């Protein structure tokens, strides 16, 4: 690795050359600008993930009340004698119940 | 590419925007409840002062 | 009788479609207002926040 | 099948690019217009059905 | 990594150079203007929300 | 290519179109009976309220 | 400017004070509370100006 | 009867596809949330660390 | 071919990102829960002081 | 300049406590904890400033 050692001197001298240009009243001030930029990006990312959690919460509740609206028709239909309509309503209610469950878990 | 789907797509985008705003604020420094409680209670005692007088 | 039976399918479904469109139209307006609110809010959270140089 | 997957990959990005270019206020309003235009035609049909009926 | 550090070093000085060129009276006033401009838009939104409400 | 056959051809095409519409709707999300039953029964009780008053 | 604002606000809080006593006496509780919220706000703002002065 | 028997399966066939679409719609939203959440953790880890380089 | 097997790959690719991120947390050391639990308890002492007042 | 910053934290801490007391009197228990946690944070900040001074 004799060649590697020659390349090592090039690396070491470059590190030193750069560290000459490192000032004692500027680089520190900047290092702290960068950290504010890092923070802003992260906040935005966190907010946009919290957003979908709430959005799932919106969808979820809807299914719970939609399920009730189907049942109401199922009761009416059975009172009247409209038996065919009742079954379709019940089948749909069961589907919404599963959908809401899946959302709750997701939440 | 349908109106119903097109409508639904634009609606959800907006709901995520409303959340985007809420979140962005929480991280920034928000809440506005602290003061509200103090104003509500204090406003209570104001009603009491109004009733006295 | 056939004409009345067929115009009755059509009027029922016309009525159904009319209502469903109207649901969408009134939601369209409030959803635009919601969108504007989110847009203003985000910009403000950024401006007001100190998390910036 | 890798070729077909390449095509799907290209179409996907293109779908996103144009999706990104939409703005809600405009697209949402535009959707309602479409629903209205369609309704007007459905009504006309109700118009003829009624006239033949008479 | 030395290269990336070089870039950061350059950006730093440039950040200072332009920082030095600001004068408080102007920048501080300019900040208030920005806060005002933003507020006006937030109000408009309150305007629509109220109109749909009516 | 005759009028009778020509007429019959255009008629059947249209009947398949009427079905096309019914089917296309069923798959999409249609029916409009659910609400109708509820309105019919409720309208029943309205007649009862009208008779009372 | 600070002097005027501090006093220019107080006096207003007073008017709101009188308005609150009339609203209470006449029978208006919800109205009185509102005026008191308005009073209270000018009062809190007024303290802030005082220290600043 | 022959058409009606085929039609029954065709109705069942469509519904089965819709079930997969129902799975896919839920999966999509979560995969978007997961990918974004994972990145924020990685971004934080790099910001926390870095090594002498 | 392209289909229910495009998804396959993408879902796996997202899960791999989550898994890698979690591992990075373990291997760097978890300071998060160490700060958090101690902070909450610290507050809990002051609940008594606040309650007493 | 450090002396200016330092004092502020000392009075800000008091403003949080005041809300903590109110919240506990009312029954708003959740709001009280957040206020106490923030007060503890300001107390540390002021300490650090005093030492720095």
Question: What's the CA gap between J19 and D49, in Å, rounded?
Answer: 71
Give the CA dihedral A67, A72, A73, A79, nearest 10 degrees.
150
SS3 C37: helix
Question: What's the CA gap between E37 and F42, in Å, rounded?
Answer: 54
Q: CB contact, 8 Å: A32 with chain E?
A: no
Neighbours of chain D (3+ CB pairs under 8 A): B, C, I
How far apart are the CA of G10 and the nearest CA of chain B, in angstroms? Answer: 16
Q: CB contact, 8 Å: H32 with chain A?
A: yes
Cβ(E38)–Cβ(C47) below 8 Å: yes
Question: What's the CA gap between C25 and C19, in Å, rounded?
Answer: 10
Cβ(A67)–Cβ(A100) below 8 Å: yes
Give the CA dihedral A94, A95, A96, A97, nearest 10 degrees.
50
Residues 6+ apart with CB under 8 A from H41: I21, I22, I24, I25
The continuous run of DSSP H or E covering G29 comes out as helix G29-52
Question: What's the CA gap between D24 and D31, in Å, rounded?
Answer: 10
Question: What's the CA gap between G4 and A101, in Å, rounded?
Answer: 61
- Closest residue on chain C to A32 (Cα): C53
Phi-psi region of E22 (alpha: psi -120 to 50; beta: other; left: phi over 0): beta
Cβ(C23)–Cβ(B3) below 8 Å: no
Q: How many CB atoms lie within 10 A of CB A6?
A: 9
Q: How far is CA C5 from CA C1, C16, D43, D49, D54, in A?
A: 6, 17, 17, 11, 14
CA–chain centroid gap for D47, Å, is 25
For residue D30, give both structure tokens: 């535009």
- Closest residue on chain H to A95 (Cα): H19
Give the CA count within 13 Å in the CB-facing half-sphere of E22: 12
The experimental method, as deposited, was cryo-EM
Cβ(C12)–Cβ(F32) below 8 Å: yes
Q: How many CB atoms lie within 10 A of CB C48?
A: 15
For residue A102, give both structure tokens: 């899946």
Q: Which one of D25, D29, D49 has the shortest CB-CB distance to C10?
A: D49
SS3 I35: helix
Q: Which one of A43, A46, A55 has the shortest CB-CB distance to B16?
A: A55
Backbone angles phi, psi at A14, to 5 degrees: -60, -45
DSSP letter string, H17-46: HHHHHHHHHHHHHHHHHHHHHHHHHHHHHH
Q: State the Cα angle at D32 between D30 and D38, rounded to 5°.
A: 105
Q: Which string of b and e fits E2-38 if b means at least 16 CB within 10 Å?
A: eeebeeebeebeebbeeeeeeeeeeeeeeeeeeeeeb
For residue B41, give both structure tokens: 């209670």
Cβ(G49)–Cβ(G6) below 8 Å: yes
Residue A93, burial from CB neighbour count under 10 angstroms (0-12, 13-18, 19+): buried
Judge E/A contact: 3 or more CB pairs < 8 A: yes
Residues 13-52 of I with CB under 8 A from H: 14-15, 17-18, 20-22, 24-25, 28
3 state SS for E27-47: HHHHHHHHHHHHHHHHHHHHH
CA–chain centroid gap for E22, Å, is 14
Q: State the Cα angle at A24 between A19 and A28, rounded to 5°.
A: 90
SS3 E54: coil
DSSP letter string, chain J: -HHHHHHHHHHHHHHHHHHHHHHHHHT-HHHHHHHHHHHHHHHHHHHHHHHH-
Question: What's the CA gap between H17 and I4, in Å, rounded?
Answer: 12
**Strand ranges (DSSP E) for D1-54?**
none
Question: What's the CA gap between D15 and D17, in Å, rounded?
Answer: 6
Q: Which string of b and e fits D19-48 if b means at least 16 CB within 10 Å?
A: eeeeebbeebbebbeebeeebeeeeeeeee
Question: What's the CA gap between E36 and E31, in Å, rounded?
Answer: 9
Q: Which of F43, E22, C7 shows the shortest CA–CA distance to D45?
A: C7
- Closest residue on chain A to E15 (Cα): A30
Residues 6+ apart with CB under 8 A from B31: none
DSSP count for chain D of H helices, then E strands: 2, 0
User: In this structure, what DSSP letter does residue C50 have?
Assistant: S
Q: Which of D19, D27, D33, D42 to mutate to test the interface with B (most CBs of B within 10 A)?
A: D27
Residues 6+ apart with CB under 8 A from C47: E34, E35, E38
- Closest residue on chain I to H27 (Cα): I11
Q: Which of G2, D47, B40, A25 shows the shortest CA–CA distance to E20?
A: A25
Q: Which string of b and e fits J13-39 if b means at least 16 CB within 10 Å?
A: bebbbebbbbbbeeebeebbbbbbbbb
For residue J13, give both structure tokens: 């801490």
How far apart are the CA of D17 and the nearest CA of chain I, in angstroms? Answer: 19
Q: Which of D3, D4, D13, D15 to mutate to test the interface with I (most CBs of I within 10 A)?
A: D4
Residues 6+ apart with CB under 8 A from E5: A18
Phi-psi region of B30 (alpha: psi -120 to 50; beta: other; left: phi over 0): beta
Residue A16, burial from CB neighbour count under 10 angstroms (0-12, 13-18, 19+): exposed
Question: What's the CA gap between H50 and H53, in Å, rounded?
Answer: 7
Q: Which of B19, B20, B22, B30 to mutate to test the interface with A (most CBs of A within 10 A)?
A: B19
Question: What's the CA gap between A84 and A95, in Å, rounded?
Answer: 18
Neighbours of chain A (3+ CB pairs under 8 A): B, C, E, F, H
Residues of F in contact with A73 (CB under 8 A): 34, 37-38
Q: Which string of b and e fits H12-46 if b means at least 16 CB within 10 Å?
A: eeeeeeeeeeeeeebeeeebebbbebbbbbeebee
Q: State the Cα angle at G30 between G28 and G33, rounded to 5°.
A: 105
Q: Which of C32, C35, C36, C44 to mutate to test the interface with B (most CBs of B within 10 A)?
A: C35
SS3 C36: helix
Cβ(H36)–Cβ(I16) below 8 Å: no
Residues of C in contact with F32 (CB under 8 A): 12-13, 16
Q: State the Cα angle at I27 between I24 and I31, rounded to 5°.
A: 90
Give the CA count within 13 Å in the CB-facing half-sphere of F52: 6
Question: What's the CA gap between B15 and B21, in Å, rounded?
Answer: 10
Question: What's the CA gap between H9 and H35, in Å, rounded?
Answer: 39
Q: CB contact, 8 Å: F43 with chain A?
A: no
Question: What's the CA gap between I13 and I21, in Å, rounded?
Answer: 13
Question: What's the CA gap between B36 and G28, in Å, rounded?
Answer: 23
Using the beta-carbon criterion (under 8 Å), do D7 and I6 form an inter-chain contact?
A: no
Q: Which one of I39, I40, I51 has the shortest CB-CB distance to J24?
A: I51
Q: Which of B33, B36, B39, B40 to mutate to test the interface with J (most CBs of J within 10 A)?
A: B33
Q: CB contact, 8 Å: C3 with chain D?
A: yes
Question: What's the CA gap between A92 and A67, in Å, rounded?
Answer: 8
Q: How many CB atoms lie within 10 A of CB E44?
A: 14
Question: What's the CA gap between J31 and J17, in Å, rounded?
Answer: 11
State the alpha helices, DSSP H only, in chain C. Answer: 2-48
Q: CB contact, 8 Å: G37 with chain B?
A: yes
Judge H/A contact: 3 or more CB pairs < 8 A: yes
Cβ(I2)–Cβ(D1) below 8 Å: yes
Cβ(D29)–Cβ(B12) below 8 Å: no
Question: What's the CA gap between A90 and A75, in Å, rounded?
Answer: 10
Give the CA count within 13 Å in the CB-facing half-sphere of G28: 13
Cβ(J2)–Cβ(J28) below 8 Å: no
Taking each helix axis from N to C terminus, what angle separates B3-29 and D24-53, rounded to the nearest 10 degrees? 150
Using the beta-carbon criterion (under 8 Å), do J21 and I50 form an inter-chain contact?
A: yes
3 state SS for A29-85: HHHHHHHHHHHHHHHHHHHHHHHHHHHHHHHHHHHHHHHHHHHHHHHHHHHHCCHHH
For residue A81, give both structure tokens: 């004698």
Judge H/I contact: 3 or more CB pairs < 8 A: yes
Question: What's the CA gap between E16 and A28, in Å, rounded?
Answer: 11
Q: How many CB atoms lie within 10 A of CB G37?
A: 17
Cβ(C51)–Cβ(A39) below 8 Å: yes
State the alpha helices, DSSP H only, in B1-53. Answer: 3-29, 34-52
Resolution, given in Å to one decimal, reads: 5.0
Q: CB contact, 8 Å: B53 with chain G?
A: yes
């Amino acid at each position: 690795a004799l060649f590697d050692r020659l390349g090592r001197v090039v690396r070491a001298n470059l590190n030193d050359l750069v560290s000459k240009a490192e000032d004692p009243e500027k680089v520190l001030e900047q290092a702290v600008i960068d950290m504010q930029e890092d923070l802003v990006q992260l906040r935005q990312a966190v907010a946009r993930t919290i957003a979908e959690e709430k959005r799932t919460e919106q969808r979820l509740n809807q299914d719970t009340q939609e399920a009730k609206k189907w049942e109401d028709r199922a009761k009416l239909a059975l009172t009247n004698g409209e038996e065919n309509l009742a079954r379709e309503a019940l089948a749909r209610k069961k589907s919404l119940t599963d959908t809401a469950a899946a959302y709750q878990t997701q939440l | 590419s349908s109106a119903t789907s097109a409508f639904e797509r634009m609606e959800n985008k907006v709901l995520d925007m409303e959340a985007t705003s809420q979140a962005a604020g929480e991280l920034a420094g928000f809440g506005i409840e602290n003061q509200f409680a103090q104003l509500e209670a204090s406003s209570g005692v104001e009603d009491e002062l109004a009733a006295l007088k | 009788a056939q004409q009345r039976t067929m115009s009755e399918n059509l009027r029922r479904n016309l009525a159904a479609l009319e209502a469903k469109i109207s649901e969408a139209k009134t939601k369209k307006n409030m959803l635009q207002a919601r969108a504007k609110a989110a847009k203003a809010n985000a910009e403000l959270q950024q401006t007001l926040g100190g998390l910036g140089t």
